Amino acid sequence: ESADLRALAKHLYDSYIKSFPLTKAKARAILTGKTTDKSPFVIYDMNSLMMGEDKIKEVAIRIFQGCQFRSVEAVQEITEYAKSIPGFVNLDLNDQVTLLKYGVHEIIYTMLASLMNKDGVLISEGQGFMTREFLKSLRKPFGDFMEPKFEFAVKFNALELDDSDLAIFIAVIILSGDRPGLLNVKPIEDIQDNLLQALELQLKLNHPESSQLFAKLLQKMTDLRQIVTEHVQLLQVIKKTETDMSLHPLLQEIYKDL
Ligand SMILES: CCCCCCCCC(=O)O
Ligand SMILES: CCCCCCCCC(=O)O
């Protein structure tokens, strides 16, 4: 019923606020220059990066490892959020692991869009702002790492979704019954059905003007999956070229293998 869907929407949003310290509302307040929030230190070159360390191996590797640490933190936040989705903790333990293993990256890039604009990305809980041009200036293959994410974010941000919309969308992503190696797909699809229903009512009530936003949002999955596929290919290159560079155990378990 409609009231039950509104209740599910409210639960997920409340639960999202508790799991993710830097929301899209806080991120937009920082980027647009609002009084609810302070201005970030901008990193656009090597000098601002060095000063930035004071305010906030080689440069390219150091930045990459910084992104790897934030990814670990994000995985932790997503795992805590997943546990609050009704029915998730009641699923087979191997399926819970499988849903998180494949789901987190898709959620990482969805939530990364909230911290981005066409010019750059908010870093270290919004204290910093690293420019896109600087990240693109990095030596190969590191220069190519964030560019497809910026390309996705520009398109995704045009949908003008808020945190309450994103809370249900990332729940829908987690409960994907088409992940490889799942043992019981039906209770997963059963939860996703209710999540899809809650998302549809949320988008119709929150964005009444925005025609077919529901379909438009579900279409963004292809782009998300593609981002994930490309990202995986890029780490394989690094693994072979930078044999002294170590990847966090949590990330190693998620990445190998997809
Ligand atoms: C809680 C999900 C937030 C995504 C931000 C993680 C950024 C990861 C990266 O720089 O690649
Ligand atoms: C020397 C660290 C360079 C920072 C790379 C980006 C880190 C992302 C973050 O702090 O959220």
Curated annotation (Swiss-Prot):
GO biological process, one term: negative regulation of inflammatory response
Induction and repression of expression: (Microbial infection) Expression increases when incubated with M.tuberculosis or its lipoprotein LpqH; induction is TLR2-dependent (at protein level).
9aaTAD, short sequence motif: residues: 249-257
Reported disease: Defects in PPARG can lead to type 2 insulin-resistant diabetes and hyptertension. PPARG mutations may be associated with colon cancer.
Domain named NR LBD: residues: 4-257
Regulation: PDPK1 activates its transcriptional activity independently of its kinase activity.
Record's comment describing the protein's domains: The 9aaTAD motif is a transactivation domain present in a large number of yeast and animal transcription factors.
One Gene Ontology CC term in the entry: receptor complex
Impact when changing residue 70 to H: In colon cancer; sporadic; somatic mutation; partial loss of ligand-binding
PTM statement from Swiss-Prot or TrEMBL: Phosphorylated in basal conditions and dephosphorylated when treated with the ligand. May be dephosphorylated by PPP5C.
UniProt keyword terms in alphabetical order: Activator, Biological rhythms, Cytoplasm, Diabetes mellitus, Disease variant, DNA-binding, Glycoprotein, Isopeptide bond, Metal-binding, Nucleus, Obesity, Phosphoprotein, Receptor, Transcription, Transcription regulation, Ubl conjugation, Zinc, Zinc-finger
Nucleus keyword on record: yes
GO molecular function: alpha-actinin binding; arachidonate binding; chromatin binding; DNA binding; DNA binding domain binding; DNA-binding transcription activator activity, RNA polymerase II-specific; DNA-binding transcription factor activity; DNA-binding transcription factor activity, RNA polymerase II-specific
Shown residues within the full chain: 235 to 504 of 505
UniProt-annotated binding residues for rosiglitazone: 68-71, 105, 231, 255
Keyword Protease: no
Subcellular location: Nucleus; Cytoplasm
Chain positions of cross-link Glycyl lysine isopeptide (Lys-Gly) (interchain with G-Cter in ubiquitin): 18
Tissues where the protein occurs: Highest expression in adipose tissue. Lower in skeletal muscle, spleen, heart and liver. Also detectable in placenta, lung and ovary.
Protein name, per record: Peroxisome proliferator-activated receptor gamma
Family recorded in the similarity comment: Belongs to the nuclear hormone receptor family. NR1 subfamily.
Complex and partners: Interacts with FOXO1 (acetylated form). Heterodimer with other nuclear receptors, such as RXRA. The heterodimer with the retinoic acid receptor RXRA is called adipocyte-specific transcription factor ARF6. Interacts with NCOA6 coactivator, leading to a strong increase in transcription of target genes. Interacts with coactivator PPARBP, leading to a mild increase in transcription of target genes. Interacts with NOCA7 in a ligand-inducible manner. Interacts with NCOA1 and NCOA2 LXXLL motifs. Interacts with ASXL1, ASXL2, DNTTIP2, FAM120B, MAP2K1/MEK1, NR0B2, PDPK1, PRDM16, PRMT2 and TGFB1I1.
Chief localisation class: nucleus
Region called Interaction with FAM120B, residue ranges: 1-46
Task of the protein: Nuclear receptor that binds peroxisome proliferators such as hypolipidemic drugs and fatty acids. Once activated by a ligand, the nuclear receptor binds to DNA specific PPAR response elements (PPRE) and modulates the transcription of its target genes, such as acyl-CoA oxidase. It therefore controls the peroxisomal beta-oxidation pathway of fatty acids. Key regulator of adipocyte differentiation and glucose homeostasis. ARF6 acts as a key regulator of the tissue-specific adipocyte P2 (aP2) enhancer.
